[PDB]
Amino acid sequence: LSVFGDRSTGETIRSQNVMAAASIANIVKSSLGPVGLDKMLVDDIGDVTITNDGATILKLLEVEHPAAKVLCELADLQDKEVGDGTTSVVIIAAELLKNADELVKQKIHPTSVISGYRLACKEAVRYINVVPGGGAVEAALSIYLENYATSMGSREQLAIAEFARSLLVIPNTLAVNAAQDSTDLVAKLRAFHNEAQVNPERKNLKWIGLDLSNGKPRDNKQAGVFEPTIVKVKSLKFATEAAITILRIDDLIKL
Amino acid sequence: KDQDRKSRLMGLEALKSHIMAAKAVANTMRTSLGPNGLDKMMVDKDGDVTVTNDGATILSMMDVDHQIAKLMVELSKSQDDEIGDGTTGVVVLAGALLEEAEQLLDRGIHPIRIADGYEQAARVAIEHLDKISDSVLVDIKDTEPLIQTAKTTLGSKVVNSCHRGGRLEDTGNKMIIEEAKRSLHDALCVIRNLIRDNRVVYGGGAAEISCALAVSQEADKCPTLEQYAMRAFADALEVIPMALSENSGMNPIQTMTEVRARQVKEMNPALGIDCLHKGTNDMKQQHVIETLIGKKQQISLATQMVRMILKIDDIRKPGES
Amino acid sequence: VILLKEGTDSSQGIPQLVSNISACQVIAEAVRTTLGPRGMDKLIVDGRGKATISNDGATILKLLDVVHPAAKTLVDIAKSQDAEVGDGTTSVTLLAAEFLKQVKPYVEEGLHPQIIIRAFRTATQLAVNKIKEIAVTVKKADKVEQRKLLEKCAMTALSSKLISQQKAFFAKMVVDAVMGIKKVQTFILRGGAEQFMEETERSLHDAIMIVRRAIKNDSVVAGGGAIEMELSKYLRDYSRTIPGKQQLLIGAYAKALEIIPRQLCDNAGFDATNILNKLRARHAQGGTWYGVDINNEDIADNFEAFVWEPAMVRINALTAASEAACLIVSVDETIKNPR
Amino acid sequence: YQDRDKPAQIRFSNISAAKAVADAIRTSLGPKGMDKMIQDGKGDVTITNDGATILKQMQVLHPAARMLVELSKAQDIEAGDGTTSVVIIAGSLLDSCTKLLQKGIHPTIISESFQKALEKGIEILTDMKRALIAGGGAPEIELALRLTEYSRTLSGMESYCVRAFADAMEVIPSTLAENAGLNPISTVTELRNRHAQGEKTAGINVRKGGISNILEELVVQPLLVSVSALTLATETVRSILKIDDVVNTR
């Protein structure tokens, strides 16, 4: 072969776009939530900009990669449309690509993975239909989508089941930022939501979130921690569309 | 203990490495197939030298350290008791089936599924041989035609001058006497096989080409991944007759397909290859007829040898510490 | 100059456990494909130069003789399994390494090894209680003679084999022999070759064990990974109602049980993804005995197909598997006296 | 043998350069085709799955690869559709021709054989351009199934050559089944048995993800697409087979 450029394919190119997207999330993972840590932005001049806003970081961050640039354009669409949730969108998308890359190693085709994420996002919006914050939505969808997966079959279980685990990053990330055992709080958070699905009795706790100040569960219905419904709904639609856009890529051609 | 410096070979690469070991023994022996087969020079460990084209003698003296090759050599101990002459037909057919399997492993088919198809195609072929066979001494015991069959067998050996100190007619060299001894051993099997069953099938490649058509048609009726293996069984059957024409100095594929269409268009009775450069095809006129029990044991022992090598997927041996 | 070790090799911490976990997977890989009746074989050669070809997980591990000590623990656990049961060495070694594989990233994330043991000891006891709950005793099912059901068990084990057509004849004699094996080119074998009689020697030996174990113990469970998926369902649904670090561990324990039916599909050439996903759906709907069918590439009720295994054997496998993973997980350091 | 002059080095050079162009574009086959990351020399990027667009940006220099690019342009002019299927067919035939040349067959005999397969190939699709044919790899299976029947009746080298022409058509439905999230082998296998027993209605439906009645799922294409594809592909494969060497000038 004689060409004026390069060419490459295989599992490494999907992983390269996965490892690239994961780097953008980690740049804005610790700054998630109200107790998010500040981060420096050193320009080529030498100056330094310090802030903890995840949206401000992505707008000023510069990473030479095509896959990473998709998440930057992604945050702009979510910003201009709503103006909030750009940090959770980038983090949720990176986790879906991480789990999706693991499925592709298990001989699960991306088109089967993509067809599952389109189904999990659809039913998740139906189950969602303000809303309690603090990871209450992500913990409830993690249980409903895990049960709905067994109803479909046809190579969509692992795709929808991995979509459920990806949502837990939000209460897992907020718990780490609050200096608490995230494995405990996320487990305590899933236990209350699971008891809500077993039976509708009032002894079972319902609509529980996370207390970032005290470090424990908290009924956000009474505590007054809410968000707009369009944020949690569109953030999953944008995150799913971006993971699909990056996961459909299967080749790299340079000139 | 002795895990350090332990030889290991696993995965799909091991199966292709095992197939490469069997093909080396099949490609070595496919040249010595037929009466015009190329001989093999043996260099004994004690300095002795001999020349022969016998499939069993080649496998006995072949010192192979590979474990997969040793299993193929062990098949000769079971094959020579039944057939005697054409141990090459089993090794050539086994190596042919393994080569065609390598095209199926790339498609993503499991080795056990390949072995399940060959076992299904073998019963298709073995069932076809029972139909097109013919008898010689049905219902009466006679000595006239039975003697004629053995006369064509010894003709493949150096004793052909006397196939019908001193000379072979009194039944000048020890090694020719040695090869003369084995020339009767297969003749005893040719007579013993005809005694166990006088039914026989036309040799010279006529049986393999007819079975390949039946195996190919029946492959359409198997809706499962064993279908590709059945088609591979057809192409593997053609290697025996395609090897005879090669050893005689003719175009293999043109002589192969020319006999196929003759077996489909000209007449229903199977027709072989004129490897001895006789008048024409239709080996029934040339009186070149192989036994039915032999052809069945060939396809059977070949499918067994392919099944055993396919179900093996890991070799382990500790090295010198 | 005045050195503490002086050639003494020793390491501890997370790098030691992760090192032992990878060694345990190497032993499973040597017997991963041998799972099932139609499993791939392994060739082993000794200093004599003779080759041993067999898919017996018990005989293979005895011949390897691995020097790594974490591997010696797994091989030793197989010997206790033989005296306890006589089989199930491949399931114990393959399933023990799967528990280690799933808790590997959590160990790297700083989760303590002792917290992992509390999940295995807990989920194992919950699984043993579910086996005795699902296990059914079959002595006079529908007033059918036991010789009839025992023949259906041996026929299914011998189905899709060299004696597939004449499996009924071999089914009767196997049951009658239970109520040595010899070859002819005591059970005398007649076939067209020696390998047909060598494979049939062990293929009938499996049916003899099935008929033997049914007479000894009438309490059984659905094989082919059917119980492994129900325990994977019960423990996964139970882990959801467990607040703490035991949630992710008991769930990982559940997902590790799915390796048994996953390899029965892979070893049989089938697509483990399509079957294991379709199978997990049938278990959620209420299928308590559905499993893998080695013959047909589809989901089938192994209980109705008379593919049974004793309930105590599956209990001793999980106990030996969890005890082996816990013993490796409880290890932190490897000490070596130079001598 | 000696092989003083080795023109086979140019055959495997043309086949490898031709097969390499198809190995990339094949994943972009069908509605569920996999996209690609085309990086221009100036660093710019763009995501797309159009087959004709991918070939234009490849900037190929090899002669055999250039003929596939001009081949894809011809299908856009004649029929206007099926651009990816032509380059995939031409690449698979050359992949199958590699096995024939190893057996000792001349390229001219292979070329004349495909012309005979193309003759019966057009007759098969005409029986199954005021006409329409099913999609989703339906004619590719019937074309692969019925040509294998003709190869049994023929004699000489045509059987091995025409059979390779038939097996090469199975790459199209094998590629569609792959992108649709199915098994490429079991899906193509189920269609050949459905075609031997049924008719062209059997195929792949990517919208539902499985085999179904193609005519009922509203997936149909005209006859000129599959006919012009085999015609232009065979003539391109024949041209690559007839090339023994390339000589530069000045």
Q: Where are the alpha helices (DSSP H) in B155-205?
A: 174-196
Helix (H, G, I), strand (E, B) or coil at C309: strand
Q: Which of B185, B208, B200, B81 is nearest to B145 (CA)?
A: B200
Q: Which residues contact B94 (CB under 8 A, 6 or more apart)?
A: B22, B26, B72, B75, B302, B305, B306, B309
- Nearest CA to B58 among B86, B98, B36, B83? B86
Residue linked to tokens 């382990």: B316
Tokens of B11: 């995965």
Residue carrying the six token digits 């969509």: A156
Apex D220 CA angle, D174 and D117, nearest 5: 55
> Closest Cα partner for D118 from D240, D241, D44, D229?
D229
Beta carbons within 10 angstroms of residue C182's beta carbon: 10
Distance from C-alpha of D214 to C-alpha of D132, rounded to nearest angstrom: 12
What tokens appear for A199 in the block? 């039976």
Q: What is the DSSP string of A195-228?
A: HHHH---TTS--SEEEETTTTEEEEHHHHT-EE-
Please answer whether residues C256 and C99 qualify as being in contact, where contact means their C-beta atoms are separated by less than 8 angstroms: yes
Interchain contact, C278 vs A106, CB within 8 Å: no
Give the whole-angstrom CA distance, residue D7 versus residue D129: 41
Radius of gyration of chain D from its Cα atoms, rounded to whole angstroms: 18
Query: Are residues D153 and B261, on separate chains, in Cβ contact within 8 Å?
Result: yes
Phi-psi label, residue C159: left if phi above 0, alpha if psi -120 to 50, beta otherwise: beta
C137, β-bridge pairs:
C219
Q: Which residues, other chains included, contact A153 with Cβ-Cβ below 8 Å and sequence gap of 6+?
A: C277, C278, C280, C281
**Are B256 and B249 within 8 A, CB to CB?**
no
| Long-range Cβ pairs for the range A13-17 (8 Å, 24+) | A13/A249, A13/A250, A13/A251, A13/A252, A13/D37, A14/A101, A14/A104, A14/A110, A14/A247, A14/A249, A14/A250, A15/A101, A16/A67, A17/A66, A17/A67, A17/A97, A17/A246, A17/A249
Whats the size of chain C, residue-wise? 339
Give residue for tokens 């569960």. Answer: A217
Residues A168, A99: Cα–Cα separation, whole Å: 12
Dihedrals phi, psi of C313, to nearest 5 degrees: -65, -45
Q: Domain range spanning residue C160?
A: 141-185+214-220
A184 with C273: Cβ contact below 8 A:
no
Question: How far apart are the C-alpha atoms of B212 and B219, rounded to whole Å?
Answer: 11
Q: Which two tokens stand for residue B237?
A: 């059957």
Window 100-129 of D: residues touching B by CB (8 A cutoff) are 103-105
Q: Give the method of determination.
A: cryo-EM
Could you tell me whether strands B289-291 and C136-137 are parallel, antiparallel, or unpaired per DSSP bridges?
unpaired
Instruction: Tokens for C205, please give them.
Output: 């030996």
Contact yes or no for C220/C214 (Cβ under 8 A): yes
What is the residue-wise DSSP string for C234-255?
HHHHHHHT--STHHHHHHHHHH
- Within 13 Å, how many C-alpha atoms sit on residue D50's CB side? 10
User: In terms of Cα–Cα distance, which of B163, B160, B158 is closest to B179?
Assistant: B158
Is A84 one of the annotated binding-site residues? yes
SS3 B201: strand
For B306, nearest residue in chain C (alpha carbons): C195
Question: Does A191 contact C273 at a Cβ distance shorter than 8 Å?
Answer: no
| DSSP 3-state percent helix, strand, coil across chain B (nearest 5) | 60, 10, 30
Q: Of the candidates D134, D145, D146, D144, which has an alpha carbon nearest to the alpha carbon of residue D205? A: D134
Name the maximum alpha-carbon separation found in chain B.
Answer: 68
Cα(C136)–Cα(C116) distance, integer angstroms: 32
Put simply, whether A109 touches D (Cβ < 8 Å) is: yes
User: Would the CB atoms of A251 and D36 count as touching at under 8 Å?
Assistant: yes
Name chain D contacts of A244, Cβ cutoff 8 Å. Answer: none
Interface test mutation site (partner D, options A8, A104, A254, max chain D beta carbons within 10 A)? A254
C-beta of residue B273 within 8 angstroms of C-beta of residue B244: yes
CA C267 to chain centre: 13
CA atoms D68, D69, D70, D73: torsion sign: positive
B274 is in an annotated binding site: yes
| C232 within 8 A of C290, measured Cβ to Cβ | no
Q: How many interchain CB pairs under 8 A, B with C? A: 74
Per-residue burial over A136-145, b if 16 or more Cβ lie within 10 Å, else e, is: bbbbbbbbbb
Number of CB atoms found within 10 A of residue D66's CB: 15
Resolution (Å) of this entry: 3.1
Q: Distance between CA B45 and CA B60 in Å, rounded?
A: 14
| DSSP result, chain D | ---SS-THHHHHHHHHHHHHHHHHHGGG-STT---EEEE-TTS-EEEE--HHHHHHTS-B-SHHHHHHHHHHHHHHHHTSS-HHHHHHHHHHHHHHHHHHHHTT--HHHHHHHHHHHHHHHHHHHHH----EEE-TTHHHHHHHHHHHHHHHH--TTHHHHHHHHHHHHTHHHHHHHHHTTS-HHHHHHHHHHHHHHS-TTEEEETTTTEEEETTTTT-EEEHHHHHHHHHHHHHHHHHHHT--------
Cβ-count burial of A95 within 10 angstroms (0-12 exposed, 13-18 middle, 19+ buried)? buried
**Ramachandran area for residue C237 (φ above 0: left; ψ -120 to 50: alpha; else beta):** alpha
Tokens representing A193? 């939501």
Which long-range contacts does A142-150 make (Cβ < 8 Å, 24+ apart)? A142/A167, A142/A168, A142/A190, A142/A193, A143/A190, A143/A193, A143/A194, A143/A197, A143/C240, A144/A197, A145/A120, A147/A197, A147/C284, A148/A120, A148/A123, A149/A120, A150/C280, A150/C281, A150/C283, A150/C284
Quickly tell me which residue has 């049986």 as its tokens. B207
CB C326 within 8 A of CB C6: no
Q: Which domains does chain D have, with CATH numbers?
A: 7-128+131-250 (1.10.560.10)
What is the rounded CA–CA span in Å between residue D187 and residue D205? 11
Question: What is the DSSP code (8-state) at residue C40?
Answer: P
**Going along chain B, which residue ranges are E strands?**
6-10, 40-43, 49-52, 200-202, 289-291, 312-318
What stretch of H or E contains B218? helix B206-219
Chain-centre distance of CA C60, in angstroms?
14
Nearest-5° Cα angle at C112, C110 to C114? 170
d(CA C88, CA B153): 55
Q: What distance in Å separates the CA atoms of residue B7 and residue A251, rounded to the nearest whole number?
A: 38
CB contact under 8 A, C43 and B2: no
Nearest CA of chain A to the CA of C212: how many Å? 37
Length of chain B: 321
Task: Reduce the DSSP state of residue B134 to 3 states and report it.
Answer: strand
CB atoms within 10 A of CB B51: 11
Does the CB of D16 have a partner CB in chain A at under 8 Å? Answer: yes
Tracing tokens 């049916």 back to the chain, one arrives at C207
Q: What is the CB neighbour count within 10 angstroms for residue D18? A: 27
The number of angstroms, rounded, from the C-alpha of B165 to the middle of its chain's C-alpha atoms is 35
CA C299 – CA C276 distance, rounded (Å): 9
Contact state of B223 with D190 under an 8 Å Cβ cutoff? yes
CB spacing of C247 vs A195 below 8 angstroms: no
Is A195's Cβ below 8 Å from some Cβ in C? yes
Task: Determine the Cα–Cα distance for residues B315 and B21; give it in Å rounded to an integer.
Answer: 13
Is B227 at the interface with chain D, CB within 8 A? yes
| D95 labelled ligand-binding | no
The chain A residue lying nearest C109, using CA atoms, is A183
The per-residue b/e assignment along C241-268, b for 16 or more CB within 10 angstroms, e otherwise, is ebbbbbbbbbbbbbebbbbbbbbbbbbb
Residue numbers followed by a gap, chain A, C–N over 2.5 Å: 129
Report the residue of C102, C236, C247, C259 to disrupt the A interface, i.e. the one with the largest count of A CBs within 10 Å.
C247
Residue B101's closest CA among B311, B306, B313, B312?
A: B306
Instruction: Find out whether A133 is annotated in a ligand binding site.
Output: no
- C-alpha span between A30 and A36 (Å, rounded): 6
Pairing status of strand C219-222 against strand A48-51: unpaired
Q: Considering Cα of B303, then B304, then B310, then B311, what sign does the dihedral take?
A: positive
Helices (H), C146-245: 146-158, 167-178, 194-216, 226-240
Residues of chain B neighbouring D109 (CB-CB closer than 8 A)? none
Query: CA B88, CA B58: separation in Å to the nearest integer?
Result: 10
Question: How many residues does this entry show for chain D?
Answer: 250
Q: Give D-chain residues touching A252 at CB under 8 angstroms.
A: 36-37, 39
3-state secondary structure of A112: helix
- Give the contacts of B100 (CB within 8 A, at least 6 positions apart): B232, B233, B235, B236
Burial letters B86-111, b for 16+ CB under 10 A, else e: bbbbbbbbbbbbbbbbeebbeeebbb
Q: What six digits make up the tokens of D35?
A: 């996209």
Q: How far apart are CA D190 and CA D202, in angstroms?
A: 9
Three-class SS state of C41: strand
Pick from D75, D85, D81: which is nearest to D22 by CA?
Answer: D85
Q: Do D61 and A2 touch (CB under 8 A)?
A: yes
Report the alpha-carbon distance of residue D66 to residue D84 in Å, rounded: 15
Residue whose C-alpha is closest to residue B199's, from B122, B132, B142, B153: B132
What CA–CA distance (Å, rounded) separates B271 from C256? 60
Instruction: For Cα atoms B154, B160, B163, give the angle at the middle one, nearest 5 degrees.
Output: 60
Query: Which tokens go with B274?
Result: 């004129």
Alpha helices (H) in B51-87, listed in sequence order: 55-61, 67-79
- Beta carbons of D21 and D63 less than 8 angstroms apart: no
Please tell me which of the candidates D35, D60, D178 has its beta carbon nearest to residue A248: D35
Nearest C-alpha neighbor of C213 from the set C68, C123, C85, C114? C85
CATH number assigned to the domain comprising residue C167: 3.30.260.10
Q: How far is CA B166 from the centre of its chain?
A: 35
C255 and chain A: CB distance < 8 Å anywhere? Answer: no
* CB contacts, 8 Å: C243 with chain A: 184, 187-188, 191
Smallest CA–CA distance, residue A1 to chain D, in Å, is 5
- Amino acid C41 reads D
- Residue A106 DSSP one-character state: T
D36-39 and A251-254 strand pairing: parallel
Query: Is A7 in contact with D24 (Cβ distance < 8 A)?
Result: yes
User: In the block, which residue shows the tokens 């999907």?
Assistant: A14
Residue with tokens 């070596």: C336
